[PDB]
Structure formats: structure tokens, C-alpha cells
Write an enzyme that holds these catalytic residues in place. Sequence first.
Site, PDB file in Angstrom:
ATOM      1  N   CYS A  58     -12.699 -28.967   4.418  1.00 46.66           N
ATOM      2  CA  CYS A  58     -11.430 -28.290   4.202  1.00 46.66           C
ATOM      3  C   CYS A  58     -10.309 -29.287   3.945  1.00 46.66           C
ATOM      4  O   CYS A  58     -10.169 -30.286   4.658  1.00 46.66           O
ATOM      5  CB  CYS A  58     -11.097 -27.452   5.431  1.00 46.66           C
ATOM      6  SG  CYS A  58      -9.558 -26.516   5.267  1.00 46.66           S
ATOM      7  N   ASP A  63       0.842  -1.200   0.000  1.00 47.04           N
ATOM      8  CA  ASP A  63       0.000   0.000   0.000  1.00 47.04           C
ATOM      9  C   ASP A  63       0.879   1.254   0.000  1.00 47.04           C
ATOM     10  O   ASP A  63       2.100   1.199   0.154  1.00 47.04           O
ATOM     11  CB  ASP A  63      -0.997  -0.007   1.183  1.00 47.04           C
ATOM     12  CG  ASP A  63      -2.254   0.870   0.929  1.00 47.04           C
ATOM     13  OD1 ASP A  63      -2.385   1.450  -0.194  1.00 47.04           O
ATOM     14  OD2 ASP A  63      -3.119   0.979   1.862  1.00 47.04           O
ATOM     15  N   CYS A 106      -7.049 -29.524   9.231  1.00 45.33           N
ATOM     16  CA  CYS A 106      -8.273 -30.316   9.214  1.00 45.33           C
ATOM     17  C   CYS A 106      -8.000 -31.768   8.853  1.00 45.33           C
ATOM     18  O   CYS A 106      -8.836 -32.633   9.141  1.00 45.33           O
ATOM     19  CB  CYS A 106      -9.291 -29.675   8.268  1.00 45.33           C
ATOM     20  SG  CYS A 106      -9.817 -28.017   8.816  1.00 45.33           S
ATOM     21  N   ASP A 118      -7.854  -7.965  -0.347  1.00 46.53           N
ATOM     22  CA  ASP A 118      -6.992  -8.077   0.827  1.00 46.53           C
ATOM     23  C   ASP A 118      -7.849  -7.794   2.061  1.00 46.53           C
ATOM     24  O   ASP A 118      -8.807  -7.017   1.986  1.00 46.53           O
ATOM     25  CB  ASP A 118      -5.872  -7.023   0.795  1.00 46.53           C
ATOM     26  CG  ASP A 118      -6.310  -5.683   1.347  1.00 46.53           C
ATOM     27  OD1 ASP A 118      -6.805  -4.803   0.584  1.00 46.53           O
ATOM     28  OD2 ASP A 118      -6.112  -5.487   2.570  1.00 46.53           O
ATOM     29  N   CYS A 126      -7.114 -28.512   4.220  1.00 47.35           N
ATOM     30  CA  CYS A 126      -5.874 -28.021   4.806  1.00 47.35           C
ATOM     31  C   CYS A 126      -5.277 -29.044   5.772  1.00 47.35           C
ATOM     32  O   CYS A 126      -5.940 -29.977   6.237  1.00 47.35           O
ATOM     33  CB  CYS A 126      -6.087 -26.669   5.497  1.00 47.35           C
ATOM     34  SG  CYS A 126      -6.423 -26.693   7.280  1.00 47.35           S
ATOM     35  N   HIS A 177      -5.449 -22.532   9.099  1.00 47.83           N
ATOM     36  CA  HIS A 177      -6.751 -22.938   8.607  1.00 47.83           C
ATOM     37  C   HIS A 177      -7.463 -21.784   7.899  1.00 47.83           C
ATOM     38  O   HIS A 177      -8.038 -21.967   6.819  1.00 47.83           O
ATOM     39  CB  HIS A 177      -7.625 -23.482   9.729  1.00 47.83           C
ATOM     40  CG  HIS A 177      -9.047 -23.570   9.311  1.00 47.83           C
ATOM     41  ND1 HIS A 177      -9.512 -24.578   8.493  1.00 47.83           N
ATOM     42  CD2 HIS A 177     -10.068 -22.694   9.455  1.00 47.83           C
ATOM     43  CE1 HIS A 177     -10.783 -24.351   8.212  1.00 47.83           C
ATOM     44  NE2 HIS A 177     -11.142 -23.212   8.781  1.00 47.83           N
TER      45      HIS A 177
HETATM   46  C1  LIG Z   1     -10.322  -2.192   6.127  1.00 46.93           C
HETATM   47  N1  LIG Z   1     -10.853  -1.284   5.122  1.00 46.93           N
HETATM   48  C2  LIG Z   1     -10.095  -0.626   4.247  1.00 46.93           C
HETATM   49  N2  LIG Z   1      -8.745  -0.712   4.220  1.00 46.93           N
HETATM   50  C3  LIG Z   1      -8.308   0.131   3.195  1.00 46.93           C
HETATM   51  C4  LIG Z   1      -7.035   0.513   2.755  1.00 46.93           C
HETATM   52  C5  LIG Z   1      -5.794  -0.011   3.459  1.00 46.93           C
HETATM   53  C6  LIG Z   1      -5.220  -1.327   2.901  1.00 46.93           C
HETATM   54  C7  LIG Z   1      -4.152  -1.913   3.818  1.00 46.93           C
HETATM   55  O1  LIG Z   1      -4.920  -2.231   4.987  1.00 46.93           O
HETATM   56  C8  LIG Z   1      -4.162  -2.646   6.109  1.00 46.93           C
HETATM   57  O2  LIG Z   1      -3.250  -1.674   6.509  1.00 46.93           O
HETATM   58  C9  LIG Z   1      -3.876  -0.512   7.033  1.00 46.93           C
HETATM   59  C10 LIG Z   1      -3.390  -3.916   5.800  1.00 46.93           C
HETATM   60  O3  LIG Z   1      -2.507  -4.273   6.865  1.00 46.93           O
HETATM   61  C11 LIG Z   1      -3.007  -5.280   7.739  1.00 46.93           C
HETATM   62  C12 LIG Z   1      -2.581  -3.742   4.530  1.00 46.93           C
HETATM   63  O4  LIG Z   1      -2.070  -5.009   4.152  1.00 46.93           O
HETATM   64  C13 LIG Z   1      -0.773  -5.302   4.664  1.00 46.93           C
HETATM   65  C14 LIG Z   1      -3.436  -3.194   3.392  1.00 46.93           C
HETATM   66  O5  LIG Z   1      -2.588  -2.886   2.298  1.00 46.93           O
HETATM   67  C15 LIG Z   1      -3.025  -3.400   1.043  1.00 46.93           C
HETATM   68  C16 LIG Z   1      -6.988   1.503   1.756  1.00 46.93           C
HETATM   69  N3  LIG Z   1      -5.697   1.911   1.314  1.00 46.93           N
HETATM   70  C17 LIG Z   1      -5.640   2.938   0.465  1.00 46.93           C
HETATM   71  N4  LIG Z   1      -4.454   3.355   0.009  1.00 46.93           N
HETATM   72  N5  LIG Z   1      -6.756   3.595   0.018  1.00 46.93           N
HETATM   73  C18 LIG Z   1      -8.047   3.252   0.353  1.00 46.93           C
HETATM   74  O6  LIG Z   1      -9.010   3.881  -0.089  1.00 46.93           O
HETATM   75  C19 LIG Z   1      -8.163   2.103   1.269  1.00 46.93           C
HETATM   76  C20 LIG Z   1      -9.429   1.684   1.676  1.00 46.93           C
HETATM   77  C21 LIG Z   1      -9.495   0.688   2.653  1.00 46.93           C
HETATM   78  N6  LIG Z   1     -10.607   0.177   3.326  1.00 46.93           N
HETATM   79 ZN   LIG Z   2      -8.783 -26.495   7.459  1.00 46.98          ZN
END
Ligand SMILES: CNc1nc2c(CC[C@H]3O[C@H](OC)[C@H](OC)[C@@H](OC)[C@@H]3OC)c3nc(N)[nH]c(=O)c3cc2[nH]1
Ligand SMILES: [Zn+2]
Lengths: 352, 352
Positions: free
Chosen positions: B287, B79, B292, B249, B289, B318
Site C-alpha cells: 500500500c 441517493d 503504511c 458505493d 498510503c 488506509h
Molecule cells: C447495502 N446494499 C444496498 N444498498 C442499496 C441502496 C442504498 C445506497 C445508499 O446506501 C447507504 O445508505 C442507506 C449509504 O450510506 C452509508 C449511501 O451512501 C451515503 C448510499 O447512497 C448511494 C439502494 N438505494 C436505492 N435507491 N435503490 C436500491 O435498489 C438500493 C440497493 C442497495 N443495496
Molecule cells: Zn495503507
Amino acid sequence: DRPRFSFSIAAREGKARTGTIEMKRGVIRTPAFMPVGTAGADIILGNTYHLMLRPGAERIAKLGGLHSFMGWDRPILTDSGGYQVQSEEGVTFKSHLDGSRHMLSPERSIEIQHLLGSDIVMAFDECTPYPATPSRAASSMERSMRWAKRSRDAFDSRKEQAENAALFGIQQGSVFENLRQQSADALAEIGFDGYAVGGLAVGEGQDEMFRVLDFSVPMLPDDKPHYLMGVGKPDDIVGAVERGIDMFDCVLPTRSGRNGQAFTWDGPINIRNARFSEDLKPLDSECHCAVCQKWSRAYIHHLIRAGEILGAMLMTEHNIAFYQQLMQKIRDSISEGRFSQFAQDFRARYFA
Amino acid sequence: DRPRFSFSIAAREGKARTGTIEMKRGVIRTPAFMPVGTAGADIILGNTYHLMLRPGAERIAKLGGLHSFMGWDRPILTDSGGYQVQSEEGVTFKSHLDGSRHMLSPERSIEIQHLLGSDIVMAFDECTPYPATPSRAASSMERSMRWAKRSRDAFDSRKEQAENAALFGIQQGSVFENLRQQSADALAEIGFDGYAVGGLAVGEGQDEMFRVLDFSVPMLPDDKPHYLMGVGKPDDIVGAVERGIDMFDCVLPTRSGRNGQAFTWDGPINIRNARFSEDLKPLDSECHCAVCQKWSRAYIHHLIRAGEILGAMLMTEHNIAFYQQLMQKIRDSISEGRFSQFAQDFRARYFA
Ligand SMILES: CNc1nc2c(CC[C@H]3O[C@H](OC)[C@H](OC)[C@@H](OC)[C@@H]3OC)c3nc(N)[nH]c(=O)c3cc2[nH]1
Ligand SMILES: [Zn+2]
Ligand SMILES: CNc1nc2c(CC[C@H]3O[C@H](OC)[C@H](OC)[C@@H](OC)[C@@H]3OC)c3nc(N)[nH]c(=O)c3cc2[nH]1
Ligand SMILES: [Zn+2]
């Protein structure tokens, strides 16, 4: 078909021995390290005291016994439950988990271990506190010997257990040679499949522990396995093998694995320390484990500092594996007649 | 030799698509779930914000980049760092870990992602809070589009990045159709390798999220992958695929795995609940995995109730595996023309 229990000594060097225990569920190579089952190893440990409290031995039996419950079809050793937890009958105590009442006696301990289904059953003993006066050490050891006979009789009364499991007696006597001899004599007169050295690793320190082992291990039957309970650090294991011990258990590899400490041939390291943040070497340079094949100290440092469960898992895998590599090197060196040199080389490097 | 980036659609059903992204380090099957790398998957995530703070992007580059650091040679997505962390230049903030100062701008975000070495780079955007008024949603989206152009130019200036990585633009506009259209138009005029739907999974709830996806996804280029950021629960994924999303994600499988929640085809379960203490079935009956295949709900319950790290590891394994089995079933059903039926059957059982 393997026998219920057969210990054979394949090679010796000084007081050190290497060989095998054959049981119905598998062969155990000695000297052996026996890791906690909830953490390669030939035998794992079940935690009797914890299992008594959650979910209870009857519930484990309802679920098919520990082998089925844990998914482990090879031998399992259980303790008798009292160290973990008073009168001549046994010990009473209340559970902190739900306040329920629990009694523990030689007979109940053996029944609990039967319900758990373990292959190596420990007699119910009293681990004398340290330090102990001669009088208190003697009265404690005498009670433990009466309890050892009761444990023997309870085990022999349960056909499935008597025919398929093994029973170890536990020597007590604190640091006193005369009491250790009386305890050894009493245990040998009763007769057990193996003999544990109890009452050590309770605060006496390595010098005193080794002093007690020097006279205590020769008192046990030579032709049976010798188990030093609660030991220990890698250098404790090496010195105990030099004094005739065949089996070991210790919370250290798992406890250390969850608290940032890794065992290496160059001594323990605390992987959270900043000095590892850019260290691209594996945890140990010679370790054959999967962690050291794939990941750096720097990455493990990062995971643990970040609170990631993966980091604790990799540290624990590494530590368990290190312990088993240590035991393999011990067995090979005794078999090859170079254990004395191995112990000297091990210490020079581990403490450098 | 694979191309830098090539998305091909192999089959369609309604708005749903299945296909592949080819990159230098591997092929990504879509629809795809992308798990956190520190938790089979074709691509994993690096946590830009966390890595900025510990050990820092420059230090990761010194250690060889994330692929070497994490021991993962296949694609990695990062990100842009701002959601996680104000002026037209960017955002400033102080680290709670050591008080150090950090600025984040489109240019710095792209440079951080370059130093980390990721294969899919996200443009630097503002995730508009929810709810937002039309005026505030518009001014936020307009800034994000100016920042998207700056991100494009910074990425194109770095030869290694431009030739070997891919850049995704992020649509904003809150829940407003006219702003979502303006954002889509601006992103397409700049030109990106893929297009994310940003600004959702921020408290609006599933009905509103699906309503926004209904009009927003068709505004993006059909021939490029569509990534819904932050989504989500299994039923959110299924409904988003029905609306044209290709990539997902979510912190849920790992967060749930550490807090006692397991995903199953019959819905989520909290394995710590007493109703699982004697349940000999695996976590999920179908599952494939390794957990399981070997262990029961009763044993996993026991490990987690006992505080054993092994329990959290097995739950996480899991859950990650369940997510990848879900995605495989989604891909197969679209390819076979039975995704509509799959979604109906999935929901009937998951919510029963
Ligand atoms: C939950 N709702 C949610 N998460 C949004 C993330 C964060 C993604 C990020 O969300 C966690 O970081 C904080 C994750 O860490 C656990 C990251 O993965 C490692 C993940 O990066 C892809 C968004 N990022 C950007 N740049 N722009 C967005 O509009 C956006 C919207 C989201 N809605
Ligand atoms: Zn499983
Ligand atoms: C540290 N010094 C140490 N530990 C002694 C244990 C406990 C062994 C037990 O020690 C932990 O339980 C508490 C382990 O749990 C982590 C058990 O493994 C699961 C292990 O059971 C074999 C002893 N047990 C008995 N029955 N008698 C002893 O004299 C004795 C001496 C020990 N010294
Ligand atoms: Zn290792």
C-alpha cells in the site's frame, strides 16, 4: 551535534522567560506545551502508566522503543507512573486489564522509562492529595525526596540513559511554603536537569494554585527549566508563565476535542450546541490551523452530532493547534517585551 | 468548459470497461469507487436520508449547498432517500430524532437533492426486499418505473438542476430476468444519463448477485455508465467489473475502519487481534498510503485497543486508500488488456 541537555534563556519579562532546551533529538522552544503523543509541538508525551499495562515496557523495547513505535524522532517526555497508579519501597497494584501484578519503585520507574526510550525522564514521586494537613504533607514530601535520590542513582547507573536522556526532579509540599522550600533545597542538593512543580492541579483551584506558584517557583534554580505538571486551561498557562513556568502538559485539548469543546481566543465553546448549527465562521476567526482554513462551525457541529469520527479528529486538530498558537504568541511577546500587555489582552477577550 | 455530462469508454476487455465521466465540477475515472463524503476519489457521496433529518435539506441550502458545507468542489452523488427510509404517492414516516413528520415522493426526493446541490441525482425507487415472489417483485418494479418517470419530470422542471446535474434511473426486478428486462426497457424509454442496478446486495449472496448481473447489465444501454448500488467487498467489485459495472458505493471501508477491520491485498484482517501486537509490518506491504508509509500494525493495534480516535482515523484512511488503489489497478489493467489476469491474481492472493 546537539548536547544531551542545554537550557538557555533568550529573554525575560518580569518572572516570565523564553528560550530553548537543546537535546540530541531536537530543540524545544519555551514556554512549551507538550501534547499527548497519541493525539507545531517540539516534544510529545508518552503515557507511562498505560504503556506499563499495555503492551508493557519490555514489549515496547522489543519493538524498538517509543520513538520507533510512534513514528516520532524528536524528544519524548514520560511520567514516572505513580500519580497514574504503599511502602517506603514503592507501590504495588493489580492491573484491571488482566489481573497481573505490578510493582513500582524509583528503580523500576526509571527502568520502565529507559525501556520506553524517553528523552525526559521524571523522578518517581508521590503526588500528595489535596487537601493535606501539614504533617501529612511533610511526611509525603520527605518520602518523595528520598525517592528522588533513588531515582537519580538509578538513572545514573544506566549508561545509555545517563548519556542521552535528562532527568527532572519534582517538588512537593502541598500548599505550604516551608515544605516547598525544604523540597526545593533537597532537589537542588541532589541535582537535576530540570525541576517540576508537582502536587498542583489536584482540586485547589486557580487562586490557590497561583498563590503557591508565587512563592514556589523562585525556590527552584533559575537557570533550569520549570515544569508545572497537569496544567492546564489557557488562562492557567498564561498566569503560570507570568510566575516563571517554562513547560506544560494537560489532557484538556484532547479530552475536550473528543467531547465537543473547542478552545478559541473568545473562550471555550461547545460545538454541539444548536447555536452553531448555521454558523459559517471557522472554529476561531484568527486560527491559522487547517480546520479553520477549510471548514465551518456548522459543518463540525454536524459531524459531531452525527457521531462521525471525522468531527472529533477536526476538533482535536484545532485544539492542539490553538494550544501551540497560544505558546507561540507567549514566546514572541516575552521576546518582544510585551507579554504583560499580551496577558491583559488575552484575558479581556477570553473571558468577555 | 466541461459538459454537463459525457461518458466515454476508452478501453474494453470482455464485458469490462474503463473510461471517464466528464461533468462541470470534474472528471470521474471509471470504474470508480465513491466513498462517503464524511469519511484519490473523483466523486463523494452525500447521505440524503441523514441530511433530511439533520439539519434538513432547506437548512443545507441556506448554508450554500453540500459542496460549500462539506468543503468539496468536485462532483457529489446523492441517493433518493427511500431505501434509507406506503402508497402510490410515496412514503410517509416519522423522525426518531425529534418526531417530526416527513413525506417522500419522487417530486420531493428530487427537490431535496436539488436543495443539497448534488451533481448526480438518483431517481426515487423502491428497493424490493429479498426474497420476493414473482408477483410482488413485478408490482414493486412497476411502481418504481412509474416513480422513475415522475422523477425524470421533476428533475427536468428545475432549470438549475436540468442544466447542471445528471439523473440516473434504477433498474429493479429482484432476481427475475423477465422483470429486469421490463425494467431496463422502461428506463431506456424514459431516458437517463446513467443506469443503476438496484435491488441487490440485500441478502442474496455473491453467487446469486453475479448470476443476476450476468443477464441484467447487458440489458442497460451500453453507452451509459452502470452503477451497482451497495456493492461492496473488494472481490464483489472485481466480479462486478467483469460483468460491466462502472461505479460502486459501500459502507464497508468506513464501517470496517471504525470496527478494527483493515482491507489488504491478502484479505481483510482484524487489527485488534493479539497476533498483530508485535507485527512491525505496515497494514499492507504494498500500500502506498500515508499510514503504511509511517506506522506499523503493532502501533495501530495499540491505538485501537487503547480507544484512541487516532487509531480509527488511520484505519479509515488506509481502507479508503486501499479501495482507490484497487480501482486504479482495475482501470490500468483494463486499459492494458490484462484485467482477466489481474482478477485471477487478485483472487488467488486475497483468498489465500
Ligand atoms: C447495502 N446494499 C444496498 N444498498 C442499496 C441502496 C442504498 C445506497 C445508499 O446506501 C447507504 O445508505 C442507506 C449509504 O450510506 C452509508 C449511501 O451512501 C451515503 C448510499 O447512497 C448511494 C439502494 N438505494 C436505492 N435507491 N435503490 C436500491 O435498489 C438500493 C440497493 C442497495 N443495496
Ligand atoms: Zn495503507
Ligand atoms: C491533572 N493534574 C495533575 N496531573 C499531575 C501529574 C500527572 C501527569 C500525567 O498526567 C496524565 O496522566 C495521569 C497524562 O496522561 C493523559 C500524562 O501525559 C501523558 C501526564 O504525564 C506527564 C503529576 N505527575 C507526577 N509524577 N507528580 C505530580 O505531582 C503530578 C501532579 C499532577 N497534577
Ligand atoms: Zn483552528
